[PDB]
Design a protein around this ligand. Structure first.
Ligand code: FAD
Ligand code: FAD
Lengths: 450, 450
């Protein structure tokens, strides 16, 4: 029977194994995972530290026992040491006793995920510097936070943004450091990040943007972080400066993006047709640019993992690409986005323009309403929508998914300006705020012809 | 100068006039309207009677003074008595002094809307039987509600359902009478309306479904309503049994649906190329069936009004059709839908199947979560989505707009099962509930092929 080896099992491996067992019940599925746990939702780390999680056992949706019950050979606490594609073998180490074995496979599923970026900064190995990815990192931060009054987050991505907000609302002195000029520049344009950065300042968070960390120096009174512009002392530092594909097992053996992300076809097959990749270990087709990108999100992991099971024997279901749709909740604001920002679109030489619209999402005669700040990025010549974002105290998260479907179908600002959307004052004005947003883009395009 | 006559001005006429004046500033636009007010939002009637509207003056978004300021010859309190499309002339009556005039036009915009259906039932002319459409009807119900403990709603569509809910939550004894079997069967299937009808019973509303009103008889202690199965005494009866296109001015002169709705091309031109129709006076292109239908919603009126302005001279912007996307709030429940129900699809002999899913909309480890009941109607052959509905105490209204864009682009259950949507525990599971909905539809299709 067909032998399948799965390297790594958090989200992409979990969905791949379940899919393979469901559609090929005769296949021999062996899975190796360094940790003793699977299906951990890292998105809940900041939610717990922020107080919002009572039972940490709810942060798991699967288990090694469940995959075993489904018919999988589950080998937890195993570290894959080598992958031999020409001999189609794999060498694995049992971390409980160093026992090494060499096994054959017919298909290999590379779901080894990613690992945080740790730069060559002097003193970064300090015990007051912590990572924040897996369940082990979470349990450490859970116990270490009660004593760390001063928290410093290094890296102003969405993960770093969530940690700073979660620690600020729980009685900590928070400093947010990043070398980039703005917070979360991949998701939102300057109009959005200006409001968010003001929210951090209003809540006492010290913003140290545009500064590069140079050294970590430990003393009795805490950890001293020196940047090219200032110096800070903290009780704990957390690294949130991005992720790197954990694919060195296949380096030089399958085609890769410069950062190590495995390049796949539309059926999740690598350059080696017997090695599949899914999740943080792989690149994704970015629909707005029709090129590969590294977008390490759980949405890609669960989707690509399913496709691995669909296409294990032969191509069956094509990958639909992604728009990198994301959403965040910070200081009672819902901040969502999808596709390209204006900055990213121009940074990549695309013909793009932007409209910014602020409106109450539902009529004022209602008992309450709330302003929603909206952005729409579009090609001024083809009118094709390239991206969009919404920010409001009202939960506007589902509108980003509406925009994602628009971009998936390559709809224009003219499609969105008039497409049928419901009206009821409990929810919106006669035209939905997404219609109003696209009508503003039309007016900006019209203001150009005349 | 091009002379334009607009017959009727609530929503479709308001948007048409503003659009015509903006894109043809040198048009002579003359508008006649029986009422002395424009742009009244009839959806606010039930919202006020439910205590959700402090100032009823805010239920307007434009005014005759505004249209005149924009350049239009605004003739309020005028009743158009005749239209001659051959000679391109109109005959109007000034309702303030009975004065009649006769004017010519180059183009005529027929935005005469609709009027409630009044059946030939004995006693229905009683002063205790009230209509519920325009601002004059609203003021009467606002003043009568104080003296009407017992309210009887006739017609269990969305309008009557909202009135019954509004009165019942404000201390009124409510009876909901209708001859059809379910409430709002044009929007929702039985799984949804069973829960809705149960909410009415839990809140003390007397559901008189499957009953046919036979007479209204005034008595000493109010109004006696006799049906074929029961007898009711009430203080106020409100007719909510549907709407008829108010188009008798053009009967036999332009092509019409059997109910009188004016049939237009994709540019809102009637069979007479110089007469446009928009709003409740017209039939709409229904995308799920690709046929003309009568769907009197404010969403269609504001859209088709805009298209009249853009297509006044020559065809410029095509009509995108509609999905009849709608949404309501009944007893803290957000209930939204778009496209075909399974009942309506089978009633028209369409190859259609349905899947029903109930799930918590976001993970259980969050501080709170809420169940959402979901429906997806699809063609089991082509996999094309025909319609969908969602119901939850959490505001899921935006998801119906996502399904509308899906139907607009003729996406399949396979497209929706895997299309990129954001994940963050504040909003959804790793797969958005819309993804999960379409994945269950794939499962139903899969269990039939094997
Ligand atoms: C704090 C945090 C918050 C996040 N929030 C969100 C969010 O809100 N929304 C969203 O969409 N995404 C979010 N993400 C990203 C999301 O968690 C990742 O995309 C997801 O973990 C990727 O799934 P994966 O299984 O492909 O990768 P991984 O989770 O990294 O799984 C890889 C596994 O492979 C194992 N492994 C690696 N090498 C070997 C080897 N030689 N032998 C054996 N095992 C090996 C590793 O032990 C690891 O467990 C967040 C991430 C973090 C860190
Ligand atoms: C209680 C109620 C609640 C509703 N709730 C919603 C909702 O929540 N969401 C939604 O999308 N839709 C809703 N609707 C429907 C929506 O209000 C209508 O579709 C909308 O009014 C249609 O706009 P219209 O201008 O085309 O038609 P109309 O509102 O009927 O306007 C027609 C105008 O033309 C005038 N007129 C007619 N004949 C003549 C004549 N010979 N001479 C001069 N003037 C004339 C009339 O006086 C009238 O003012 C609701 C309707 C009602 C009645």
């Amino acid at each position: 029977s067909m032998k399948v080896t799965v390297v790594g099992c958090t989200h992409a491996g979990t969905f791949a194994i379940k899919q393979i067992l469901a559609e090929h019940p005769d296949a021999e599925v062996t899975v190796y995972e360094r940790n003793d746990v699977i299906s951990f939702l890292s998105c809940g780390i900041a939610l717990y530290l922020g107080g919002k999680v009572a039972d940490p056992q709810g942060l798991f949706y699967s288990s090694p026992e469940e995959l075993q019950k489904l018919g999988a050979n589950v080998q937890m606490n195993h570290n894959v040491l080598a992958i031999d594609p020409d001999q189609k073998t794999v060498t694995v180490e049992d971390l409980t006793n160093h026992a090494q074995t060499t096994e054959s496979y017919d298909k290999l599923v590379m779901t080894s995920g990613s690992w945080p970026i740790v730069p060559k900064i002097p003193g970064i190995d300090s015990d007051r510097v912590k990572l924040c990815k897996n369940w082990a990192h979470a349990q450490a931060l859970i116990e270490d936070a009660k004593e760390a009054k001063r928290i410093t987050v290094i890296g102003a991505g969405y993960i770093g943004a969530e940690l700073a907000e979660a620690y600020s609302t729980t009685g900590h002195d928070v400093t947010l450091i990043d070398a980039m000029a703005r917070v979360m520049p991949k998701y939102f344009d300057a109009d959005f990040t200006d409001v968010i950065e003001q929210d951090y300042r209003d809540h006492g968070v010290q913003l140290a943007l545009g500064e590069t960390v140079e050294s970590f120096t430990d003393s009795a009174t805490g950890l001293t972080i020196k940047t090219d512009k200032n110096s800070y002392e903290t009780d704990l530092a957390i690294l949130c400066i991005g992720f790197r594909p954990n694919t060195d097992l296949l380096k030089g053996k399958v085609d890769m993006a410069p950062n190590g992300a495995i390049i796949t076809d539309d059926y999740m097959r690598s350059s080696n047709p017997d090695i599949f990749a899914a999740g943080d270990s792989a690149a994704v087709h970015y629909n707005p640019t029709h090129q590969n990108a590294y977008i390490p999100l759980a949405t890609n992991a669960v989707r690509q993992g399913i496709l691995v099971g669909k296409n294990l024997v032969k191509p069956t279901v094509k990958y639909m690409g992604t728009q990198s749709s994301s959403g965040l909740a910070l200081y009672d604001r819902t901040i969502v986005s999808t596709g390209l920002t204006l900055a990213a679109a121009k940074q990549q030489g695309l013909n793009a323009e932007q409209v910014i619209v602020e409106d109450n999402y539902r009529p004022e005669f209602m008992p309450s309403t709330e302003p929603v700040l909206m952005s729409l990025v579009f090609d001024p010549d083809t009118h094709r929508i390239l991206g969009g974002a919404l920010m409001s105290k009202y939960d506007v998260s589902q509108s980003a998914n509406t925009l994602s479907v628009c971009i998936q179908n390559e709809n224009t600002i003219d499609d969105l300006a008039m497409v049928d959307m419901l009206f009821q004052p409990n929810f919106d004005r006669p035209f939905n705020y997404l219609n109003i947003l696209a009508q503003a883009a039309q007016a900006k395009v019209a203001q150009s012809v005349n």
